[PDB]
Amino acid sequence: EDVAKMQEDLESMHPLLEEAAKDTMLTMEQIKVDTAIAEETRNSVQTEEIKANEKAKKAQAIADDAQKDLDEALPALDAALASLRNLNKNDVTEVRAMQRPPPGVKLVIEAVCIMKGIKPKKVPGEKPGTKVDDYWEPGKGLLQDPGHFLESLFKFDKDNIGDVVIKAIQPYIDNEEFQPATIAKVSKACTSICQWVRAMHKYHFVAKAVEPKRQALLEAQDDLGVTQRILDEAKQRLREVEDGIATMQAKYRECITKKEELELKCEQCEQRLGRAG
Template sequence: LVDKMKVDLSALEPVLKQKSTDVDALMEKLAVDQEKVHKVVEEDEALARVKAEETQAIADDAQRDLDQALPALESANQALRSLNRADISEIKSVCILLDCKPDWLSAKQLLGDPNFLRRLTEYDKDNIKPRILLKLQKYINDPNFMPEKVSLDILEELDVTMATLKEKQKKLQEVENQIKVLQEQFDSSTNEKEDLGESCAKKCNIKYTLAGKLASALGDEQVCWEESVALFEQEIINVVGNIFIAAACVAYYGAFTSHYRQLLIDQWITQCQNLNIPISSTFSLINILGDQYVIRQWKAEGLPRDTVSTENGILVTEGHRWPLMIDPQDQANQWIRSKEAKHGLKVIKLTDSGFLRTLENAISMGVPVLLEEVGLHHSCDSKTDLIIKKPICGQMLYCNCVFFKVG
């Protein structure tokens, strides 16, 4: 489990690393694009502002010149209204506009005209005759004598500059919208990265911690398992000798007491060792042929808890022939009754009238039979002897000897 957690963490690390790399790359690209766009837009906007300022400065200069000229014009008009014959000493300059010869004679006639001042103040400057304009052509042809054109050019240039500025501002808005979208993608990727990292790391750390606790808790069990594995490996090596002695025990030492049984086992072990047959030095019939679960069931069904009784139980159940049990304390009888009750045990005696028929039917049906009181006072006749000497599949015939009379 711990190894699996390590594998999961190792598998997640490249994903998180790649995600982090992608987000960092997106951040760098976003920063570069944003800086580049801002730089270009700022340059264009600065250029447009400079152009607009220059144009506005020209317009302001023109307006300032106009503002400065207006008082002079007004003063001239006022002075013109206040003119009299004594104030005018030179009139040639206006002779052309009044369609007179620019000579002294014409000037005197002009000055002698009683309507001279009125003609000056009421002069129709908007309807000057062509021939007079022709005389004024040299002044009109002067490139600097075009105030309307100059003003119009300045306004047109200002309009173009402002249109360019608006276009740049529009592009700036589009770029800012793109930057906003990229920023949202960046925020989403960052949140996804954080969620993925925190969630996966948290889950894996929890699993890893729990697995570590489990491994620590099972540390002592691991020692036991390793010892058990070593023991099982040794038992596999010794299986030939152990099974050989176990078979000998089932076949021969059922009639012996505990002391003589151990003597037989010791001699058999020594003989096997002399013949280089692998065998356990601490041989135990219970460990070789016994099943702890089955033995616990036997004890729950009434089998005595001593070692000899447990070995006898193994001999009764593992032997290929029916067992003859010497049972003065009736312990084996009670155990067999309890053990085989669920299998429909038939209990009979040699003195029963239908004993032989019951025995034959039970054997043919595979039902266990307990034959009681087999001893010196009740010996088997020839028919019974023939039946019980036959090989019985399932080992379901038990002969119970209640007592022996000796001497």
Template sequence: IQKRETDEQQKTVAANTILIKEEEAEGLKIKDSAEADLQEAMPALEEAMQALDALNKKDITEVRSYGRPPGKVELVMEAVMILKQVEPTWAEAKRQLGDVNFLNQLRDFDKDHISEKTLKKIAAYTSHEDFKPDIVGTVSNAAKSLCQWVLAIEKYAKIYKIVAPKKARLDEAMASLKAKQDSLAAAQAKVAELQAILDKLKADF
């Protein structure tokens, strides 16, 4: 009886080990796919961050000093305001530019949780023929960097919308895998315990 129980436990452990290995491979596939998608957005994002890092107080003051900004500068600043969830007006843009933490807020911007509504609003700006860093750069270097930032954030957010469900599936798969691994470890311990009893019985006879 003891041997039969041990054999059955060993069969169960062997079958579960195969299933777990399959789940691990599936989880890895989802992870690789999500990372590959995000990787697509990273170069533009890194370039935009470098552009922000290149800006200094003087550049920001230059944009803020406009009484009535050039159309291209206003276009960019309105897009920045929309991403920051504030009124897309020049008055609000000037107020934001006056904040000493303005650039840090852009660097630390929560790019993983941009709503569909905000992305639609932004698309109306980014699809404008003048909303290109090189074109904006003809009137303002600071606005050029901010234009780059908006475009990079938009690209990242669009890709993240595809990645988010994959990440959710991955989290779910990993939680399920962890539960099965724990269960397998308990079963392996049980097999070892039964085997020890069996070995002792054999030794006693």
């Protein structure tokens, strides 16, 4: 009885030994295939890492060039805006009271009124009738409050400079008397106002030639972010395959220790076969 039994235990365990052996080999080749793919994803990741490093060098090259165009006008503005802080309450009050403003001051009070978008006052001209507009009287109101004047210059902030107001003041810029070095012989407050206007004019003109650049800088960052998401989706996979390998590396080891146990069991049932014979 016992002999037959043992004999079938050994026969039945033989297929279990053959089954564990395919499983360990199956495991084996599976680690080999994920290792090769984990490597393919590693070169794929290294090529995207150079792809996002160049797209950042290119995005920065656009920002430096676009920033170069912007300090083409930015120093004059702050210089001028310094000079507007140069002005105390009376410097406005003194120009406002001028009952006979020299032609330099008229020019400057004209220029500002247009920038700030003020309605002129058509007054007699020299040739009879010929109504010419005199911005003086509406300027006076913008100087009635010196505080409210200077703030509204500090709050202009460009952007809202219609293309109308820039051709309206192209004659003033093109004027060789609209130079602050000259206005400085007659009045101080108008020298500050003279360079302010002259400045926001070029600033309006460069800031329109950095619309293309700032948009290329916008599109260059968009490219880096897509290469960035493609990259990070790859490092996620490279991580996931590597943990898959790790999990299978420990399956292989359990596969092995299971074989050893079935082998050890096969040896014993074998050993008391040739014992009982």
